[PDB]
Each structure stands twice: as C-alpha cells, then as structure tokens.
Amino acid sequence: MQRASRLKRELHMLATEPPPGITCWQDKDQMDDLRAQILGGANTPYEKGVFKLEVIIPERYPFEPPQIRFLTPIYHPNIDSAGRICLDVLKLPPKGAWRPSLNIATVLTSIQLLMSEPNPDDPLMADISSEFKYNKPAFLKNARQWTEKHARQ
Amino acid sequence: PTMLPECFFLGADHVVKPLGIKLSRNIHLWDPENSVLQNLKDVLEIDFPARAILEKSDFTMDCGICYAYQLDGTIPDQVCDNSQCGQPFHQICLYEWLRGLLTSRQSFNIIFGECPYCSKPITLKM
Amino acid sequence: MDQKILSLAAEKTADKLQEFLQTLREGDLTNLLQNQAVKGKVAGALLRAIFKGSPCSEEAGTLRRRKIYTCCIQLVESGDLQKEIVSEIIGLLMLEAHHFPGPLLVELANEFISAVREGSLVNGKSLELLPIILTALATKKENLAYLSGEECKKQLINTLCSGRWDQQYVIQLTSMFKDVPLTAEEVEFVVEKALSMFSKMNLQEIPPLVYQLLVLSSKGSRKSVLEGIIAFFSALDKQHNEEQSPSGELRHVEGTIILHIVFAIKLDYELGRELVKHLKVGQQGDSNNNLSPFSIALLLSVTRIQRFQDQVLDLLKTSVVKSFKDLQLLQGSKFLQNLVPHRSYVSTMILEVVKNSVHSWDHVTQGLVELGFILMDSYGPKKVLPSLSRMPNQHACKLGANILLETFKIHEMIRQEILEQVLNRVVTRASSPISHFLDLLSNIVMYAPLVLQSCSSKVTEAFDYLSFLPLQTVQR
Amino acid sequence: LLQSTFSVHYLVLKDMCSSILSLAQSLLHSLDQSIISFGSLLYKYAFKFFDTYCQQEVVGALVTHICSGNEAEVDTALDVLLELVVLNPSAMMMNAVFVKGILDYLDNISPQQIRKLFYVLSTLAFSKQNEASSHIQDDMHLVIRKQLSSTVFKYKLIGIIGAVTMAGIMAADEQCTQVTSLLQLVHSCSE
Ligand SMILES: [Zn+2]
Ligand SMILES: [Zn+2]
C-alpha cells in the first residue's frame, strides 16, 4: 500500500515533469511493469540513442529499489550485455545506497549521469572498461556504433 | 469538560520542549470558569491557525516514505529534530525502514537511527 | 597459447610445462591482462597450471612465480576485474604462498610495505595475501641471514608499523593483524599506530576502528586501547567546552563507542577489571584526572553488567564523597586556592553527563537512577530524626536530588521508576527520616505534574497506606 | 511447569522480562544438565513470547554464552540458536549482526560446535528474501579463505567443515559455480 501511494504520485510526476532526457509510463504490454526511455546525451557516443528500460516495482517499494534493466541493448562499462546496471542506488545498504527519500526519477537521472560519466572503478564489462579507460576513441566508436545498431529505428 | 484534559504534543523535539516547559509553568492558571480555548491561549501564550489550507495546499506534508497523508487513519506525526529536513513521517513506515538498518538499535519502546532524507539522529517511541 | 598449457597440465608434471616455461620468458603480464579481459576461470586454470608447472624444488620457476605475484597483486587492485575472479586469484596466491624459502617472501612483504606507504593501494584487497605471507615466515624453520623467518616477520612488521600509514588503509591493516600470531610487543605496536591515527580521521570512522582494535586487544593490549579511547574522547569534550565558552556528532559517537566497549566486557570479564583498576579514583586517597564525562558515561553503561554493577556504583559513591571532601577543604582554605588550578568536580561532571544524556543514552540513565537513590539512601540524615558528617552527605544527598530531577525533565520512561521508588521509600519506613525525599517529590511534581498524569496510578495506590502514617508525613 | 507458566501468564510476565534473563545466565553457568536445560527453556520462551527488545536481548545473551563460554554452556547455546532460527528466522535475521561477530572469537570453540555454528549462520544467510543481506555470506567466504590459507591443520579443518556445511545448506545455476569453486579450493588445499 506504501507501493501504491508512491507509484501514484511518481507516475503523475513522470507524466507531467519527468527529468529532461527521461520518459517513464505504465507499459501497455506489462501493466504491472513500467517502460522508461532514456534519450542519448549530447557530447557522448550514446547521442541519437533512445534506450528502452523495464521498471518492475518490488512489493516493498519504497524500502526496496526499483528493478531496472536495458531492453534495447547498450555497450557500456557499468552495463552488461543483459542490460544489468552496476549502480549503488539499485542495492539495499550497507553495500548499496537505496532509501525512500529517492525515487524512480532520481535513480534514472543517476543512470543518465552514468552514461555521461562511466565508472571504471565498478566495471560489469571489464573489456569495455579497459577500452574506455585507455582507448577513448575505440570505446566512443563502439558505443556510438552500438547506439546506431539497436537504438535506431 | 471545563476542567483540565489529558494533553500531549506531537512534533519536532526542538519545537515541543519549550511548549511542555511553558505548559508546566502556566498550568496553575488553568481556570474552569473560562472556555477550553480561552484557557489554552493564555496558558500556552499563543494563538492558533484557522485552517492554513490555501497557501500550503500541496507543500508535501506527507510521510516522505510512502508519500501519503491518511495511511489507514494514520497522519504524518513523527518528524526530524533538524531545521533543514523537518520532514514528517508515519509511525508504521518509519519503524519498517528503521527496523532494517544496521545503524538502528532498540531500547524498551524506542528505536534510534537516521532520518531517511538527511541522515541525522531520529528517535521513534512506539 | 593457453589451451597447450591446459593440455600439458592434463597428463603429467615437470616434463612439458617446465619446457614450455623456458620458451617465452617475455610477457605473462599481457597474457593475464587479456585473460581477465575474456574469462576469469580460464585465468584460474592457467594459474594452477603455471604453479604446478613451476615447482619450488627447481629455482627457474620461483622467479616466474615472483613476477606473476607482482603482476596479479598490482592487477587485483589497479585492474578493476569482477569480484569472483578477484577472490579466486587471491585464494590461489594465498594457497601456493607456503612453498618458498624466507627471502622471496621477505621481498614480497617489502613490496607490500613499499606499495602501502606511497602506492595508492587502489582497493586494498591484495592485503588478504599479507597475513598468509607472515604465516609462512612464522613457520619457515629454514634459517635466514640478515635469523629465523619469524624474526624477519618482527623486523618487517616493526618497519610497517613505525612507517607512515595512509588515512584510508589503517582499518584494513588492523582487521588483517586480527589473524597473525602476535606476541605482546607486536600487538602493542599495531594498536600504538592505530591509536596515533584517530585524530587524522573523520569521527564517523572511529567506531568500527575501535571495534576491530578491541576484538584484537584480547591477545595482549587492553589497558592501552581503553586508556587511548578515554584519552582521545576526553580531549574532544574539553575542545567542545572551550569552543562553546559539533555536539550531536560527538554525543552520537561516544554513545556507540560505549556499546562496543560493553559487548567486549560481556565477552571478556577481565576487560572490565582493567578498566576499573585504570579508573578507580580511591587508589589510596587520591583523585585522578583520568575521570571525565565519557569515562563516567562508560561506567554508567557498565552498571548494567551484573558483575560490575556493585563495584562501579560503590566507586562513584566513594569518589563523590572524596570530591566533596577535596572541595570543602579548598574553599575553607586560601593557601590551597593560590596553588591548585580549579579542576572540575565529580558532581559537576555527572550533571554534564546528565545534560549530554538527552540524546541516545537509554543505557546510561538506568545507572544514574541506581546511583542517585544510593547517594540519598546512604547519606539521608540520621543524627537528628557540624560539617563532616553533614555537608558531604547533604551535598551527596543534594547531588542525588539534582540528578534525578534533571533526569525526570528529559528521560520520560524512567518516570514511575524514580516516582514509584521515591514513594516506595516514602510510605512504609516512616521511622528513617524522609524529609529529603518529599522535598525531591515536591520539585519533581511541581516541575511538571502533567508528567505524573502519565504515571498516576502509582500515587493513588500509595494513598491506600495514608491511614498508617505519622501526621507531619501525611500533611507534608 | 515452566512451559504452562510462560504459555498462559505471559501477559503478567511480559513486564518482568529483564529479571528472567538475569536468572537465565545464572542457570547455564552451573553443571547438572537438567539445570542447564531449564536455563535453555528460559531463553527459548523469553524470545518466543515477549517483544523484540527481549528477543534482541535473548540473542545477545546467547552470543555472550557461546563466545566467553565453557563447553556445556557453548553447546546449550548453539542448540537453542538452532531452535530459534527454525522457530522464527525472520525475528532472528535482524539480530544476525551479533551472530556474525561470533566469527571474531572462533579461538574458543571445538570443531563439532563449529559445524552447528556455521550451520546456524549459513541457514540464516540463505533465506531467499534476505540475499539482500548477503553481507554475512561475503564475510564467511573471507574467514573460510583465511583458515584454508594456513599451514596449521587446526585452522584447515575449521575452514573445511564450515565450507562443506555452507555448500550443503545452499544445496536445497550461479550457486553451482560457487559450490564447485568452493569445493575445488578445498580439494587443492587438502591435496
Ligand atoms: Zn531529517
Ligand atoms: Zn507512511
């Protein structure tokens, strides 16, 4: 029921004043689940990419973080081939940083900042992280080609 | 009725202290020949607001856990002892949060640990 | 290049793997970097293959093992791998680190010292290897010359602990020495450095450091650890008082140091005796400047240990009489006032505890009450039913009341436990003088009677004994 | 007697919880297995029927008994822990924290006791819903690694027994990778 009151405001907030570069709606295919779309940031290789994310709310939300994965594939150091995201806000503490003070929109803003500023300190794809760290042009090419291949229409 | 009632305060630990102090010092000036309001006003040395509805209509005066006013009778009651947060909560929601934390420890009917928004010491007495 | 090493490891040892090991010589580095780039279990397979293929009977293999050790040690921190392969790498290296002479492991520990001083140890997960190395040096009965392997461990740990530690990696260093077979002097040097460090750290990074120090202290060094934490927190309190002439930070720290010293005193019935011995004021007649606002907080948390309750309470009581004798003698006497600097008195300190009590000190208050009713019960009046039998009893008793009034303002759950105990000593005795108790009760109620309409039944059930009471008692 | 006492009149006794526990410490410290079983029953009904604070005080008391300990006490305390986890793991789960800090004082415990102790911790760890608190899982993998990583046969066995016992518990596909890697490490250490 705390889930209900949270989803209610946030769904209305995300319909009227979502963060720029972010949309999230109750998915028509999966009406328990939500569809998010993060638009490619300018001055990054992810530009001209809209990446679909599936947003499942766990039953004890807001004590539990939302369940977020890229459905439209992305080549990233801290995002694996399966779309799984390495970010502390998506885990319960002491390891993770989740609290009900935060919301779907703040964590999607954190994900938008992660696409702009990849973390080489917490890599899921260690190949991609070494390439990002040492060989920016190769990473930028591969990530931009990745955007072009799957996030294009 | 005009006799003194059983009385207590919810609110900020730093806000409520002086009210309790002032009530204790003025309670002898309780008089059952005046009205309830006419005694409280001059005991507590204050006036009331008459329904501050228009200005702070959607200020977010909700739990800041479940984000609801009216959780099954429950009203936002438990607050932060902090000038920068002042964030109201519910009993149920703030217990369920604080019960989990590794930071939290329980005394007899008390739970110590961190306000969700500002991470400052907040106390909950069941 | 890897599959051949798997296939040479499949059948037999020291025939093909050794012969392939005298082919390349150049770059195992690139090999393990592309290996962590592709798959970690392949890297584990190769590590087993290389370490069986380079035995430590032969001397060519030891130096390949040394170079792969420097490689894997630097890549486990600086190279951000996945967690599972990190644990398997370090488990493997830890495992094969037994089969060695002394000096190769001594230079590996010198690599650790030289990394940890200046080298920003990017994670610090390589230090899990550190104890196992020192373990091998404790057990290597191959004699060295520079000496036994354990004496090399002495030298290395003395050079480590005397040398500078970075602020962020004193926690890791301490939790690691949790396992090393340490003597007294060794563990004294560990904790000497760790105590030195407290001041150049965030306050919120003291509680867990103190925790690991004390679970380590059980080896040698308890007096030292506690004298240290007392010293540091006493100085904080003095700084805070001179600046008032970070409150809710200092208090929320002290109040979780005390829990941590308390758990340990349950787990160690000796930690307590060394504490008490360190803190007993009544050593002969002498007031110590070990005692403080924190020093006392701690004791009043100790009072909830059944074994210490008594001994601690009786100390405080005796220290407090002692307080008042000292102060009385000074005030009657200018000769001493010229010489002595006005030291805070135990009375004043306790009351400052009582101000600080407000926050989070549920554990302290249940000791206060025990204390105050012990002051009043012992030094209530008797000879009418003079200075010496009167004033440090009067001031004892009148400490009592001040405490319990002050407490009754702020700890709203030990009301009906003050109140009900006052009344419990009111009603039945009526033979012992109870003047002081009703005086207390008057102040208590007066202050907030509205706060006895949260504990009211306890009075109205004491009115049922009003028939049996002498008249002044009843009227008063 | 004690069974029917605390099962019917809990509502009296809920108040006088503290006292019961200042009793229960006094029962275990003596000999005479019937006394020590009586002390067990205090602790059991004390965590069963009271509130959380008492429940929290229960586990804490058990922790002291194991850790500070002598043989009888220890054994009793572990038996009770097993009963408490199988009765109400969920309540026990939030007091898992003092249960983990046991591992800092394994210096005192005998290997049989060790099998049950790691058994408790792992049985608590692999509740499916508190993989959220895999905290203890990682820390237990750590202490296993260090014990296995020893010349001393005395430590080797502890790590072995703990590891094998954990593996059995998690064994009611990533889990299979852990167990295989675990057991392969044990084999290498043991070789
Ligand atoms: Zn707050
Ligand atoms: Zn709520």
Side-chain angles (χ1 to χ4, degrees):
Chain A
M1 270 225 219
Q2 296 95 306
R3 184 160 188 279
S5 54
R6 279 289 300 254
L7 167 142
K8 196 158 295 195
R9 274 148 212 75
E10 285 186 59
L11 269 169
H12 208 261
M13 191 276 309
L14 275 150
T16 58
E17 56 166 346
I22 299 169
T23 55
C24 196
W25 54 84
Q26 208 173 39
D27 198 24
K28 305 180 211 87
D29 43 290
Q30 290 160 320
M31 201 61 73
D32 51 324
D33 310 355
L34 319 169
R35 172 61 52 79
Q37 295 186 357
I38 298 194
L39 324 179
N43 319 325
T44 78
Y46 301 105
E47 205 192 30
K48 313 176 196 199
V50 181
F51 317 137
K52 304 177 163 61
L53 293 87
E54 214 46 32
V55 193
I56 335 303
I57 302 303
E59 263 293 286
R60 315 193 51 270
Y61 184 82
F63 304 100
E64 288 189 34
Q67 300 156 61
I68 297 191
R69 274 187 314 97
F70 287 81
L71 308 185
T72 328
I74 196 185
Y75 174 94
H76 200 263
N78 321 120
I79 319 166
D80 69 354
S81 60
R84 301 180 17 78
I85 307 97
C86 182
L87 190 60
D88 66 330
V89 305
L90 300 169
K91 177 59 185 200
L92 287 201
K95 302 152 282 268
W98 173 248
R99 39 186 192 159
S101 16
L102 311 179
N103 85 333
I104 290 156
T106 60
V107 300
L108 288 170
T109 300
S110 320
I111 292 155
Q112 260 203 329
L113 187 47
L114 186 62
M115 288 160 37
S116 77
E117 295 188 47
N119 214 350
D121 308 338
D122 297 313
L124 292 180
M125 305 296 274
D127 50 354
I128 303 180
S129 193
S130 62
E131 203 191 37
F132 175 79
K133 164 166 172 86
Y134 296 116
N135 196 342
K136 299 271 177 192
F139 172 83
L140 296 160
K141 285 164 196 170
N142 294 314
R144 212 175 56 250
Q145 292 156 19
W146 217 266
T147 303
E148 293 149 34
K149 285 184 289 273
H150 299 284
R152 215 64 181 161
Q153 305 153 36
Chain B
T2 187
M3 208 73 52
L4 186 88
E6 61 242 278
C7 66
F8 58 97
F9 315 151
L10 303 100
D13 252 39
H14 62 271
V15 180
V16 171
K17 264 303 158 175
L19 295 172
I21 295 289
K22 189 197 288 167
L23 184 50
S24 78
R25 302 219 170 190
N26 293 279
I27 197 164
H28 72 113
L29 314 176
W30 194 265
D31 165 67
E33 310 310 314
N34 301 315
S35 85
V36 163
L37 301 187
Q38 176 52 59
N39 283 297
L40 281 159
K41 278 185 271 184
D42 56 29
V43 159
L44 297 163
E45 303 172 47
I46 54 156
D47 283 41
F48 301 93
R51 311 211 212 165
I53 291 160
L54 72 152
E55 316 93 341
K56 313 309 307 308
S57 267
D58 311 322
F59 84 91
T60 328
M61 62 131 164
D62 299 309
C63 199
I65 319 289
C66 67
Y67 283 60
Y69 197 88
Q70 280 277 350
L71 184 149
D72 271 15
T74 320
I75 303 311
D77 46 0
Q78 308 308 127
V79 303
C80 200
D81 56 355
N82 191 316
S83 50
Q84 306 305 321
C85 190
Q87 172 56 220
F89 303 95
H90 292 147
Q91 279 296 93
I92 301 101
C93 312
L94 179 53
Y95 166 75
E96 274 201 292
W97 180 246
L98 274 170
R99 180 127 213 78
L101 303 190
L102 114 91
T103 61
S104 71
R105 91 188 110 81
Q106 51 198 350
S107 201
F108 311 116
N109 279 34
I110 293 154
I111 281 164
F112 308 103
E114 270 83 359
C115 171
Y117 283 24
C118 66
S119 304
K120 288 290 201 154
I122 181 163
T123 315
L124 185 82
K125 296 163 278 177
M126 300 295 295
Chain C
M1 287 304 104
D2 74 76
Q3 284 81 29
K4 65 167 306 317
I5 312 163
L6 319 184
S7 73
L8 291 191
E11 81 303 341
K12 193 51 201 167
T13 74
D15 50 355
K16 320 296 186 167
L17 290 172
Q18 279 186 169
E19 203 148 326
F20 182 58
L21 251 58
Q22 287 104 38
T23 62
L24 293 170
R25 308 300 297 278
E26 311 301 324
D28 268 318
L29 281 83
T30 183
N31 175 36
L32 300 165
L33 192 74
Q34 62 78 31
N35 210 330
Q36 67 75 34
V38 296
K39 190 46 163 80
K41 178 47 211 67
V42 181
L46 287 203
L47 283 155
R48 277 181 291 280
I50 296 148
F51 303 144
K52 72 184 292 207
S54 43
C56 223
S57 52
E58 58 97 3
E59 279 71 32
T62 69
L63 312 178
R64 294 144 171 74
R65 277 207 209 179
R66 275 288 299 100
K67 290 149 200 160
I68 185 163
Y69 274 25
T70 65
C71 162
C72 299
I73 290 158
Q74 63 82 35
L75 71 85
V76 66
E77 297 190 348
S78 60
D80 220 298
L81 324 174
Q82 198 270 325
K83 269 209 178 299
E84 304 165 335
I85 179 52
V86 156
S87 52
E88 290 161 303
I89 295 296
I90 198 80
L92 262 294
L93 291 157
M94 276 196 254
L95 180 46
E96 273 101 350
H98 301 102
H99 314 100
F100 265 98
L104 281 177
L105 301 183
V106 171
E107 70 173 89
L108 284 157
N110 288 288
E111 279 178 10
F112 269 105
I113 288 175
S114 300
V116 72
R117 269 170 172 163
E118 306 90 359
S120 186
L121 304 192
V122 186
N123 210 328
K125 299 204 193 303
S126 73
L127 282 91
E128 296 173 32
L129 193 68
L130 191 146
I132 315 321
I133 297 164
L134 302 178
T135 277
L137 262 71
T139 190
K140 275 293 155 55
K141 300 292 149 292
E142 293 207 322
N143 196 51
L144 286 91
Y146 280 92
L147 310 178
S148 53
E150 64 84 13
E151 279 294 339
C152 312
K153 202 199 79 184
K154 294 295 301 311
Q155 182 194 308
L156 271 157
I157 303 161
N158 205 312
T159 319
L160 165 54
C161 302
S162 54
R164 187 201 64 205
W165 292 11
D166 178 289
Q167 332 296 272
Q168 300 172 25
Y169 316 140
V170 302
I171 299 103
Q172 287 207 329
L173 258 291
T174 34
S175 52
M176 283 320 94
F177 294 142
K178 209 160 69 155
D179 313 295
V180 187
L182 297 204
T183 191
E185 290 58 48
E186 294 186 282
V187 69
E188 279 270 346
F189 290 147
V190 163
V191 301
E192 273 289 290
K193 176 51 162 194
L195 265 285
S196 307
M197 182 69 228
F198 274 119
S199 57
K200 326 163 203 184
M201 306 170 71
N202 200 67
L203 274 170
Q204 313 264 69
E205 304 171 305
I206 301 186
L209 171 56
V210 179
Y211 177 40
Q212 271 95 92
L213 252 70
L214 281 160
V215 305
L216 180 132
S217 72
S218 71
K219 291 182 192 162
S221 59
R222 310 212 197 77
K223 177 185 188 82
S224 313
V225 169
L226 292 173
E227 167 210 291
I229 311 147
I230 293 157
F232 165 79
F233 280 95
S234 301
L236 293 170
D237 261 319
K238 202 160 288 142
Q239 174 203 316
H240 187 94
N241 281 313
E242 305 318 318
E243 270 202 68
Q244 281 283 24
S245 187
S247 272
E249 306 99 299
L250 164 61
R251 300 324 178 206
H252 277 103
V253 160
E254 283 175 1
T256 52
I257 304 309
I258 285 161
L259 297 160
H260 289 218
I261 306 166
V262 156
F263 280 110
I265 300 160
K266 284 139 89 179
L267 313 189
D268 167 342
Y269 285 180
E270 326 133 340
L271 187 59
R273 294 193 279 86
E274 211 63 26
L275 152 64
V276 157
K277 183 180 149 184
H278 175 270
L279 289 192
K280 86 167 196 205
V281 151
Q283 307 261 14
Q284 309 87 8
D286 290 327
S287 32
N288 75 57
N289 269 35
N290 299 271
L291 265 85
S292 111
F294 183 73
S295 152
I296 300 151
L298 186 57
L299 292 162
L300 294 186
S301 299
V302 164
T303 48
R304 77 205 217 90
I305 298 321
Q306 198 294 304
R307 196 168 151 179
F308 290 79
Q309 155 233 0
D310 49 328
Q311 207 180 353
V312 166
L313 289 157
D314 291 352
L315 171 71
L316 296 166
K317 191 196 57 151
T318 191
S319 68
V320 157
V321 196
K322 264 47 206 179
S323 189
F324 279 121
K325 290 183 77 64
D326 308 331
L327 171 52
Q328 181 199 11
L329 181 58
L330 263 171
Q331 287 195 147
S333 314
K334 202 58 154 172
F335 174 63
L336 299 169
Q337 283 169 48
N338 284 332
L339 303 170
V340 170
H342 54 80
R343 302 141 293 100
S344 166
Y345 296 93
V346 171
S347 342
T348 325
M349 293 168 171
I350 292 158
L351 264 303
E352 202 91 15
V353 153
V354 182
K355 302 194 218 178
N356 302 317
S357 293
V358 56
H359 302 266
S360 191
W361 293 26
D362 59 293
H363 50 86
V364 181
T365 202
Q366 164 39 35
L368 283 167
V369 167
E370 274 190 76
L371 178 60
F373 284 72
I374 286 153
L375 280 83
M376 292 195 168
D377 285 317
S378 314
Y379 315 94
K382 278 306 168 69
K383 297 167 283 281
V384 192
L385 186 142
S387 60
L388 83 159
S389 200
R390 278 188 59 233
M391 290 305 316
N393 287 25
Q394 176 166 351
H395 282 304
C397 189
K398 214 73 193 68
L399 178 45
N402 285 329
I403 301 157
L404 297 163
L405 188 85
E406 298 345 294
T407 59
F408 204 100
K409 317 209 168 179
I410 77 189
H411 313 280
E412 304 76 344
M413 266 89 9
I414 324 295
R415 304 188 179 141
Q416 188 252 302
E417 322 292 8
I418 296 155
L419 196 64
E420 80 90 4
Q421 270 164 57
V422 198
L423 300 157
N424 226 322
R425 299 177 161 78
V426 165
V427 162
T428 75
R429 293 206 205 196
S431 52
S432 51
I434 76 156
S435 37
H436 51 273
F437 278 148
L438 315 176
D439 285 310
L440 163 62
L441 176 52
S442 73
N443 301 294
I444 287 173
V445 175
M446 179 168 66
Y447 184 86
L450 52 100
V451 305
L452 315 183
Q453 314 327 110
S454 312
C455 306
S456 75
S457 145
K458 181 58 213 219
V459 199
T460 55
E461 291 242 56
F463 273 157
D464 298 346
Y465 280 66
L466 208 62
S467 304
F468 312 155
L469 314 185
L471 60 100
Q472 56 182 11
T473 331
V474 189
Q475 184 62 294
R476 184 203 263 151
Chain D
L1 188 76
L2 204 75
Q3 172 59 91
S4 36
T5 298
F6 283 106
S7 60
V8 172
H9 299 250
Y10 54 116
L11 299 153
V12 191
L13 284 158
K14 189 259 180 184
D15 296 345
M16 65 214 60
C17 164
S18 66
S19 55
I20 291 159
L21 310 185
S22 186
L23 202 47
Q25 54 68 14
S26 135
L27 269 42
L28 300 195
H29 266 65
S30 285
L31 314 187
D32 188 304
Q33 188 140 31
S34 198
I35 294 191
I36 303 151
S37 201
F38 191 69
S40 147
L41 277 306
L42 283 185
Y43 281 117
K44 192 198 275 160
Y45 296 121
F47 168 88
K48 184 168 175 186
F49 283 136
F50 297 172
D51 82 20
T52 56
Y53 180 76
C54 307
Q55 286 169 17
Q56 190 155 292
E57 272 275 339
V58 158
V59 180
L62 284 172
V63 163
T64 315
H65 290 327
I66 308 188
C67 277
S68 57
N70 42 350
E71 297 64 24
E73 274 215 320
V74 156
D75 314 335
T76 316
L78 295 155
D79 319 327
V80 164
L81 274 190
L82 287 157
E83 302 316 300
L84 292 194
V85 297
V86 297
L87 191 151
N88 187 342
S90 311
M92 199 81 197
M93 202 87 71
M94 285 141 324
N95 316 114
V97 169
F98 317 93
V99 200
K100 169 194 79 179
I102 297 174
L103 296 172
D104 289 343
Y105 294 88
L106 292 161
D107 67 62
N108 209 322
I109 306 178
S110 298
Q112 318 87 319
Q113 299 161 1
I114 291 165
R115 198 193 289 90
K116 295 191 278 170
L117 198 166
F118 277 91
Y119 177 98
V120 166
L121 265 173
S122 48
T123 309
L124 197 54
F126 316 130
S127 63
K128 186 57 66 69
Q129 50 261 63
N130 204 42
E131 66 196 14
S133 194
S134 294
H135 189 295
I136 53 178
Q137 177 62 355
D138 309 286
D139 199 301
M140 270 208 302
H141 286 315
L142 260 65
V143 301
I144 282 165
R145 195 167 291 101
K146 277 195 314 214
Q147 274 101 70
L148 288 166
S149 303
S150 194
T151 315
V152 175
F153 178 46
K154 193 210 62 151
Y155 285 88
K156 187 127 284 180
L157 60 91
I158 302 161
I160 288 159
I161 294 153
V164 295
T165 310
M166 283 186 68
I169 310 323
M170 53 192 90
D173 298 273
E174 171 46 43
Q175 72 279 21
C176 306
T177 76
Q178 291 295 103
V179 174
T180 48
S181 49
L182 262 63
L183 298 172
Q184 181 51 245
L185 175 53
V186 186
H187 192 162
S188 59
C189 312
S190 67
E191 206 171 315

